Structures are given as C-alpha cells and as structure tokens.
Symmetry: D2
C-alpha cells in the first residue's frame, strides 16, 4: 500500500495539511506520524496568561477557505464560546484555548493520526529514478516501514542553547520550563536566572514574578531593555500570503532587507503588553522597597557549572568587557530555536537534494525541495524555509495557504 503523502510530525503545520487534504476534492491517500502520545504544542511553555502572537483569523484554514468547518470561529461556536469571545474584542486567543482548538480540529478530522510513532529515517524507495520513499517508523512495541510518493516534513523548531552551555538538572531550555518546574519543590527555586530578551524570556520572568512573592530573578540579556515586537499593519504585511511571493521572487538583496528591517516582527522581541506588565511589576516592587527583578542588560550567559548548592552562571558584561559569576538555584536559557532542518531525517536522500551558495537546501515556490532527476518523489517542507519563503516559515501566519499549495502541488503531480 503506497500513500500519496506521508506527514512527519503532527503540529499545527501538518494538522493544517490534513485539513487541506480533507477539504480538497482530490482523492489523496495519506498517513501522519507523531512521536508524542498526542498533539503537544509547546506545552513546556503553556504558562498561565500566555497569549497567541497571531490573530485568530490566522487559523488552520480561514485564509484559504473562509467557511471552513475547521476555522477558529467554528471551534468557538461548537464550544459555545463564540459570543463570549466576541464580547472580549481581542484578536488574540490564549495559548491554552488555541491548544484546545488544535485537539478539537484533530478529533473532527476523518483521518486518524498515528501517535507514539517516531520517524527515524527516510530512505529511497525501489528503482531508479526513485519514485517513492520509505519511511521508517518506530513505535513502543514495534518498528515498521511505510511507502509514499510524497513526504511533508514538519518537525518544528529546534531548541538552541547558548554556546558553551548544556542542558542539565539545573540548566533548562525554556522549551522544557514547565516540565522541570512542576517537579521541583517551590521553596527550592528562590533564585532563578533567565537568559534572553525575547518572548520566552519575558514570559518566564513574568510568571516567576507572579508565581511566588519571594523568588529573586536575574533577567540576563544583550539589549539594554526588552525590544517591542512589531505587528503594526504595514510591517505586518511581510506575513501576507502574497508577501511569500515577494520574498521568494526577490533578489538576495531584497531578502536581506526583509531581515534587516523586519526581524523585529518575531525574533528577540516581546509583545507590548507583556513588556508593560513587567515594567509595572518592577515599579511596584520598588515602591514597596522590595526589589526582586534584577535586569542584567548588555550581557550574555557564557557558562554554567553546578558547585555544591549553587548553579554558578558565568555572565559576560559587554559594558565592562569582563565576565563574572552569579549564583542561583536554576538557570533557564530562553535563548531561542534553530529552524527545522530536514537534513538528518533525509539521510541518503540528501545526496540528491540540491544546495545553494551558502550551503542551504534549494526549495521551490510550492515548498518542494529541489532534487536532481535521480529523485522524482516530492519532499515538502513546512518549516525550514526561512531562507527561501521568508519569516512566515516557522509561524502560524500562513498555515492555510501553504497547506493548500502543498496539496495542490501533490495533486498536480499525481495526475
């Protein structure tokens, strides 16, 4: 049994693909594999009060199909919360509600996802040219192989730690913050250092401040203060479906301009309201004569070592150009992520995938990796296209249109 398409990973990106597949009139067979027990959308960072960074209109389907049974509006309606949500007049749902939306959409799907199923490798199918790939899936009980004419790799962002710092029992990456935090005794985390100046760092520091009245926090970041995230309407157009075209068709010079001017729409920046909330908290503590939030600006965490009852953090101060040590109980590195990279999963197939000048994967407008003639099977990327398709690649901005384009590309080829 050869599938038209196999999806690796089941986050929002492949969920929207499943939705696109179901809504399409095209009869395409598919299978999806997720290594976790169920949809798990950055649960380590499901902090109380966490808000979506994207308007509810940018959901699984709406921009493609304005009357989808899988829209956020349909979800709210079924949950009997549409009226309540509309009364709020807020475009940005909480992360908790969006996580629900995903699970609700997944249940509504006809298809059935295979969970606890980790893709361990992707191999050339039989024959030359290669017309299919073999997908090696490992479950808790067994291992198996599925064959598909196309594969969509959507395995998500990859946590990045500071250079010279490794995760450990007392050094966590923000992506695992709640995993570790719920285990430890509250009275054992009285001193926390959080490295970073982005949304994760801000959200974690705010949470620590709100969670216990006596926690002391050291917010260590390279900027002089949090930088506001830009989602004003003109800059925000870089996330438009049509902006994918502008970026893709644009010269390298134009692509560089997008990053140079609008990186602050997503990377190393913090939502306005979270910034203001943090500033108010700091101010009130001052008024109360009980400061707890220590902002260590113009600085980088450069090392961590466990010394007895202390996690000893080495901090480099740019202002003085010298490093020094800071003792805390835990170091949380909210130091961001690297883009998805299909390389590892691809193995041997990588030989047939064409790279650019800077040694990155060449990808077509329809999200299909460029391959030599030796490979005829479609390898599509949802994620890992920052350099070809632009800043929407790792985000929720363009799920509906990308998934629709991928489905269309596959139908166009099959036939």
């Amino acid at each position: 049994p050869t599938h038209d398409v196999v999806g690796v990973g089941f986050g929002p990106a492949n969920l929207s693909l499943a939705v696109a597949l179901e809504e399409s009139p095209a009869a395409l067979t598919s299978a999806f594999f997720e290594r976790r027990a169920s949809i798990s959308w950055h649960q380590g960072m499901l902090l109380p009060a966490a808000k979506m960074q994207v308007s509810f209109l940018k959901d699984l389907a709406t921009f493609r199909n304005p009357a989808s049974r899988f829209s956020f509006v349909s979800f709210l309606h079924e949950r009997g919360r549409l009226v309540r949500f509309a009364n709020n007049h807020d475009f940005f749902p909480t992360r908790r509600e969006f996580h629900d939306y995903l699970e609700w959409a997944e249940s509504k799907l006809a298809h059935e996802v295979s969970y606890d199923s980790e893709v361990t490798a992707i191999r050339p199918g039989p024959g030359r040219p290669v017309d299919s790939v073999l997908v090696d899936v490992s479950t808790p009980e067994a291992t198996r192989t599925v064959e598909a004419r196309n594969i969509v790799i959507s395995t998500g962002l990859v946590p990045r730690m500071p250079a010279g710092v490794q995760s450990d029992e007392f050094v966590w990456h923000s992506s695992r913050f709640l995993d570790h935090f719920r285990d430890r005794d509250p009275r054992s985390l009285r001193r926390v250092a959080v490295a970073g100046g982005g949304q994760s760092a801000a959200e974690i520091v705010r949470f620590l401040h709100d969670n216990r009245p006596d926690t002391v926090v050291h917010a260590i970041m390279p900027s002089y203060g949090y930088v506001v995230a830009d989602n004003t309407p003109f800059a925000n157009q870089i996330f438009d479906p049509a902006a994918v075209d502008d970026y893709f068709d644009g010269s390298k010079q134009a692509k560089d301009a997008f990053w140079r001017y609008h990186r602050n729409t997503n990377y190393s920046v913090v939502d306005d309201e979270v910034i203001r909330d943090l500033y108010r908290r700091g101010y009130d503590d001052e008024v109360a004569g009980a400061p707890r939030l220590n902002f260590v600006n113009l600085a980088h965490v450069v090392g961590a070592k466990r010394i007895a009852d202390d996690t000893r953090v080495t901090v480099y101060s740019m202002a003085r150009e010298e490093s020094y040590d800071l003792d805390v109980d835990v170091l949380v590195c909210a130091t961001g992520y690297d883009p998805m990279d299909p390389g590892d999963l691809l193995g041997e197939l990588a030989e047939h995938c064409v790279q650019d000048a800077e040694g990155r994967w060449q990808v077509d407008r329809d999200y299909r990796m460029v391959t030599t003639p030796d490979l005829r099977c479609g390898i599509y990327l949802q994620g890992g296209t920052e350099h070809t398709h632009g800043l929407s690649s790792s985000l929720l901005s363009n799920l509906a249109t990308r998934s629709g384009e991928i489905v269309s590309s596959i139908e166009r080829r099959k036939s």
Copy 2:
C-alpha cells in the same frame, strides 16, 4: 400563488431573514419588498470616517452558522481584502464597507428582491379564521396584491424631531444630513447648529469640523458633555442571544433594570474614539486661537423659524431656566429615532393584535405578534420589540439568531 412568507422592507434585518431562508433545509416560498431602488442603509449618514458600532462577527449569519457563505469573512475573502482587514486588527469595519457587504450578500442570494415596491397596507386574507394576509404593493407603474401565510415587518427606525420643530429646507433630521448637504453651496453653510448628544450628533459635528476650516458649529445638548458608549464585555452581554431570553422571561422590574443600567450601551452616547477626536480638535483650535466648535451644554433646541437669510433656533438653557435665540444657516436635529411600529401598516388587522398594560403590542418569544384566535396567520417583527425582547431589537447585534428563530417558527407552524 400564496407565499409562506412576505418580508416588508429590505434592510439588514430582512436580508438576514432571506439568508436564513436560503440556508434552511425547509422549502419555504417568499417575497421581499423594498420601497427604495436598492438596499439603502442610512445613506444620509454615510459620513467619511463612520465606523460600525458592532464587531464584524455580528453579521448576517455567523452566530447561527459559523461557516456561512454569507459571513463578513466570506465577503472579505471574495473581495480579496481579508488579509488586509486582518492586518488592521480592528473588529469594527467602516460603514461604507458594511454597506458593500449588504449589497454583496444581496447579490449572492438566489432570491430576487422586488425594489421600488412600497407596501402600502396589509389586509385580512379571505375566510375565518384569517389564514393569510393580503399585501398591497405600489410600484411606479402599477399596484398589486400578494398573499402570504406569514409576514415579517422590518421597516426600520423612524426619525424623531424635537417637539415643536418640523423638518424643512433649513431644518434637517440627521438621517437626511448628506442628502441636503450635497445639494447646498459650501460657502452657504458657514454656521450650523447640531442638536443632540448621541452618536449622530457627534459624527456630524466632527464631519463639519473636518470638512471646511471655517465652518462655525454649535453643538446643543442636554448633558454637560458627550457621554461615552459602554461596550465593555460584561455590560455588552445584554446583546447576547441568551440575553434575549433573560430580558424576555424576566419580570417588568428586571426589564426596567436593563434600561436603567445599560441604556448607555446604545442610546444618547458616543463612541470613545469619536469623543476623543472631537476633544483634540477643540483643543487644537484653542491653541491656534481660532475656536469654531461651540458646545452648548445643559440645553435643548425648542423651536426653529426662518427669518430672512437666517435660521433662528430657539434654545432653552436648563442652567438659567430661560430661552434665547441663535441664528445659523442650518439646524441639524440629530435627535434620534422612534422604534419601528407595525401599527400603521397593519390597519384592520390591528384590532386582532393584543396589547399589554401600557398599550404596546404583545409579542411572543419567536417574534410573532400575539393575536386573537380570529387571526392564524403569522405576523413577525424585526424591530419594534424593544419592550419585549430588549435592547438588541433595533440593532445589528442579533441578526443571525433572530432571523433563524423566525424561519424556524414559520417551518414549525407550516406543519
């Protein structure tokens, strides 16, 4: 040919009824009559900057059917503006855009509306008990009569002038502001009085201030200053579909409490931003030493007379308890509207419509007028239910649910 339902008027209320009819699986015959040449949704007040007072989610259908082909979102999508609209992050479309939405929905409708067709009377059909009504329709060429088992009266708010003031060449009701304004020579309206403290008064004054840099405006209103319209989330729940039940089932005492506490969600109040824009304009004029906006507070317009080249407005000052005259070129009365009242149109049938203690029409939960057993045909009201169904009656808050309930009531009773 007897219709299941005839709609009198084709504003948003009956348009949503048409949409509900089309989306219903029920096979119901219908005809709609609109006196005007086309949909004309308060065009007299289609001022340049005018905004909807209601979230775009409160459209023709969405609260009832979250995936309607007639939703505002579908409209934006077809107009290729959904992405642009989402970039704005504003729940409130302009009135211009919403007017378009109505015309777009009307065109999409399978049904064909009869324009230039004014319903002049509604009469008892043949037989006892009366099982149908006869609808007298006057067109420019002819007159005709159609028969229907049910009728939905949705003829809209009725302009209300101040007591002792009649409309004329130089005394306009706000509803006909742009009609008159476009005709006159700009250099002829250097002095305008606008009576009222509500949304219409504020929008007209702002427009006059923005339109020509020399116009002098007298804003005459009973309050000490504009009162803000309340649409904060808890108060705003009075517009919920479920709040219709609370109001309807509640005692007279509870109904009175809705008006006593939440009248300021809609009547005699002004949108926050329009208030602030007016205040900033007044302020800047002061800075410039060139005041143009004269706020005449704690006052009522009590009369108007034309004396030569002046419209002489009699103003009563509450503070001084005396009246005085103000000469301007034009008096605009933005003094509001009375609720729709089916009475006049009903003629003979009214005898069989049951009234309450205070002399108002009794109406059932499904919007159907209470009649004696002499009348078995359905008379439904969209509008004119302020006293039975509450503050959403004249508004766009609840189009989707009301139209759906009316259609359901009719299907139920057909059987």
Copy 3:
C-alpha cells in the same frame, strides 16, 4: 490661644488645606486633628493592584500652583522615581504610591498634625454674636478644648451597608476588607459573596480571584454586568474647577442633569481595565473547565444571618421577583458610602446653620455653611457638598482649588 482655623480630620482634603495655608502669604494660625495614629487613606482597600482613579496632575496643589514643592512631580523627583514613572506613560499612579505621596507631603509640611486626637464635639464659643467655636478633642491620655475663629470639617465618606444587613464577624463592609482578611486563615475563606457593582466590588472580586486558585466568589449586583466608568474628556469636564461654578450657579434642574447624565463618572461604575481583567479571568476559567466566579446579576443582597459554620446570605432576584439563600463563609458588602455630613459634630451649632427645601445644609460658593447673624465664625466643608458644589465634592479632582478658596475666604474675613 485662639486659632484662625482648626481642621477636623487629616485626609487628602485637610492635607491640601495645610499645604494651601503654608503656601499662602497670609499669616494664619491653625491646628489639625486626626483620630488615627497617622494618615490612613482607605487602608482597608489598599489591594495589590489598586490604581488611582484620578490623573497624577490632580494632586494636593498643582491646579492652583503649577510649581508647588508639594506636587506629585516634586514627590517623584525626591523619591528618584520621576524618570521611571515618566517611562511608564501612565497618568494613574497606584494607590500605594499615592498613599506614600500623602505621607511624604505631610512630613514636608512645617505644621505638626495632632494624631490620636478625635474631635468629639464642636461648641459655641463665648459672646454674642458667636465669634469662635470650641473644639473638644479626646486623646488616649486626656481630653482638651481648643478655640478657633474658623473650622474646616473634612471627616470623609461614611460606609453604607445594605438595608437590613449589619456588619459582623462574617459580614464586612468593603472599607474594612483587608482589616478582616489579613486575620482569617486562608483555608477558611473558600466561599465569598461580594455585594455591589462598583469599583470596590470589582477590585475585591478580582483580588479574591488572584489571591487563591480555589476560592469561589459570588458577585451579587443589581445591574446585568459591571457598567464602565466614564472619564472621556467632555464628560470629565464636570470635574473642572470651572464646573464647580456651573453646578453651583445652575438651577436645580441643571444640577439634576449633572447627576442624570454623569453619575456614571464615579458612582456604581468600574474602571475599563479592571472590567476587562475580570472578564479575561472568567473566560480562562471557562476554558480550563474550572469556573470560580459566579456573577449573580439583577440581584440585591437583602439579609445575612450566621448559621453554624455558614454565613447565610438572602438574595433577592429581580428577574424572578423571589428571594433565596446562598451559603458562604463571608459576605463582603461593597455597597458604597454616604456623603460626609457635618450635622453630627456640629451639635448645638446646627441652630445657627440654615437648611434648604430638601432639608440639607445651605453652603456658600466658598464652601462656608450659611449661618444666621448670630454666628460669625466660619464653618467650612470639604466633603458633604455634593448637592451644592457637585460631583467633585468627595473626590480628589479639585483639592488644590478648593483648599485655596477656603484659605482665601478665611484671609478675606479676617480682614
């Protein structure tokens, strides 16, 4: 030793009087008596997130003297927080900070206030006509009497419980909320009813929701939901110094109009942001499937009785026109306050003090009670002038100008 002026009470009103006395070139002797150990500005309601309802520019002096050493800006500067405060761009300080401001201003004052000094009575001085009053002061150790040519009564709002409900160990007025709350064991207040729909009720409910994750709260109020407080710029002008004149000189009819249109600037209303915060909290609980906030709308608390371990609250539902019982651990009545009334302290002196039609005290424009010719001593009111001077009377809106006018009145009469 006869003082020119004696102040009864030492809240913001008399503090601003002391400031006005010190800034005045007039050499006036004075004494101030406060019954508490120190300035105590609604400490029972000093909740964690509580914000001023008035801009920082409306402080002790600024509207009168734009370069006062006692301004909020001077205070921030001295406290080395001016720059930090300005970075916030928020006109509204926290209540905690403002309480500090009062203390700071009081310390700066040359004059020494007499604390732990309760004024128990005010009596006629000697002579005919009466040219001074005798002020009976009770301290913990002794009692004494001081003599003054003028007296300024500023003893503040008086808590008002619902009719038929008395304060008790388990029935508290909001004004004493933190007093009682700090004593009780947290695990003993799992069920709280809060009566009222105003700022106090909303702040208390928000605090209870934020303070412990498992407290269940019943918010019982007559409206269908919180009504927003209006401070949009035109309505806000009722608080202008010049608006005192408009209200004072205006007919009774005009005075009624201020209340009829603008009572929502202060009474039975809630700040926009606090409303939205509460709505978001309720929403998130619903998403989490763990509702804790129970809004009991269109209702009044009409009785309370303690039965065993339960406080039994009798609630009257307007919708059903029937009462019923609700069992909680504590009932908090956030049911507001009555205006200051000088009647009580005045005792015998009432006889020389003139009343109006509705039987209230007549007061001159300079805040001086109207007396017969037999009394020539000045009795001034800061508070209790709602009916003569308008809505600014109990508020902080007009401290600077009123205090300045009282001082001027006193200097004028001396001469």
Copy 4:
C-alpha cells in the same frame, strides 16, 4: 566685556541652557545668538496633526527641577489650558503647542536673546594658552565680535539628501516641506513622490492624503513597510539621564549594542498611531475603488532630473535589482539628517580638538570637547554627541539634565 558663556543657536537645547543659567545660584554672564528672526523649531514640518515624540514631562527643566517656573505644566497653567490638557490624558502635546511653549519660555526668560545674528566663526582669543574665544557675529546691518570664556554650540541637526540628489525648485528636503508647499498652486501638485520610511516621510504622506482628495502619492522606502517606533518602557530607558552614564562609560562594544538593539527608538521608524492612520486611509481608498497612495517598498530614490513639466525620479528596486523612472510634479526627500558637527564653526580651534580612532571629536562626560593644553576655554556641545553620550543627544529627552550639567561644569571651572 568678556562673557562666561556664549550660546550659538537658540533652539530648545540652548533655551534649556538659558533656563539652567537663570535658575542656577551661580552668577554667570551669557549671550545667545540665533540666526533666525525668532525661535524657529522645525517650522518646515509643522504639519496640522503633528505630535511631540516625547512626554510633556521631558521639557526644559522638569527632570532637573521638578518645580520650575519654566515647566510645561507652568506654561499650561499660565495659558489657562492645564485642566483641558489633563482631561485629554495624553502625554504627548502637539508640535504647535510645544512651539508655543518654547516662545513662552523665551519671553519669560530675563535674558534677551540676540536674533538675526548668525555666528560665522569662532576664533582663538588672545594669549597662550588660549583662555577665551572670539565669536564673529553677523547681523543684517553690521558685523561684530564678542569674547567668551566658554561657548556652547547647539546649531541642530543638518538635513541630509540622498546621494546623487540635490535640492531644487522641485526636489525638496522634508525640513523645508511647508516652506515650498505654501508657495505653490494646489492644482499644481497632483503627483508627489516622498522618499523615506521614517517619521517625516509618514507625516508628509499622511498630510498630502488628507490635504486634497485627488493627490496621488508615491511613498518610496527601503523597508517592506513602515517600522514602528519603540517607546515601550524598558527600551525607553536608553533615554534616561542615568543611561547617559551607562553609554558614556560603556565599552565601544556596549555602545554598538545600544545602536544595534535600540536604533528603532528613533531612527527610520514611525509612531504607531500615524502608521495605523495611514493604513486605514489606504484601506478606505481601496474600499472606495479610488487608490491614491502608492507604496514603493524595497526601493531607494537614486536620482532626480527636471524634464519639461515633470520631475523625473530615478528609483532603484532592490527586489528586481534595476532602476526605472517615475514622473511626478515634486520629489520630497524625507531622508533624514546628519548629527550636528562643531567642526565647520570651529575653524582654527579644531586643530586643538582631539579626535578618536574613527576620526570623531572626543567629548568629556560634561559635554565639553577634549582639547590639548593649548586650549583652556570650554567648548560644549548640545548635539553632535551621539557617539559619546548616546541616542538622547539630538533629542528632547534630556534637555533639563544636560543643560544643568553644562552650567555646573562652567561654574566649577570658573572656580
């Protein structure tokens, strides 16, 4: 007659210096010279709706002296606008009002500024080492020379045109926009190109859109859309008086970090509200089917030539890496400014001013240029210290503290 200090230029910077001189107990003699007839604070850009980019608390004195007779608050109070301004609850005055504040402060000053007086050169006074400077002043009638022991150069930002583009009758710099615009027939500017993506470009485009209904505007800028200006509270701390020390004492690496992370607090960015106003305008034009605003993104103006009745603008498109021509009536270059540079005015004295590695003037913490021992006279810079003191140098953020520090430095040295 030798002055303690001579100020070159009389904008806000030297105006705040004069105020600091007057408030200081130090007896210092001074003279100020302004080339223009009066204070002229970017009048070329005094567009109708233009707002301050800085809180009113950052005025001529307040951060230094919280009770200055020259504060913005004092100004509002004298102008009987303080109450009105406070009702607005907006920290940002209009530019028109601020211009008024400057002139009001200037009039209140005891000192008399010398207008129509252009400093043409600064020369070494007699003797070695040089203890004074000679200041050559040119008036319309005469020329003269004054002698001073210190000089403060505050001559303002210098307009910068694009490389390869010169100003002319039809190519204007934004600084002279209104000068030219109020000298041309409205019906003659139907087509305007505005180069730039900063605050000036945005305001000019908005103004053109609002000013006439039929003007067509080409907004040409290198970014993909306007980038929002950051003034959220933590990033905004770079403007704190104390942040001057952090920047000054910090390593070059730290100074670079300020620019790398927080350039977007001022340069090449647009105020949030102006961005949104432009987006709403573009949207409504689209709805109306009458587009007028043409956004030419990822582009630079690289040349301009007059050809008959057309101004021919050469545009370079980064996306296509090619240039093309655009014909309009006028090209407005809102392409920014260069920092003040004392070099030209200094002439011979420059030999003795010490430069850094990158060829820029060394400046001490007290704003005094570093000189060799050959020069003992003080040369202070208000402006031109971006590289030593940071981003507040050309701004209004820190007038009060800088002027106070300069006065102090001068008193100290005279000592």
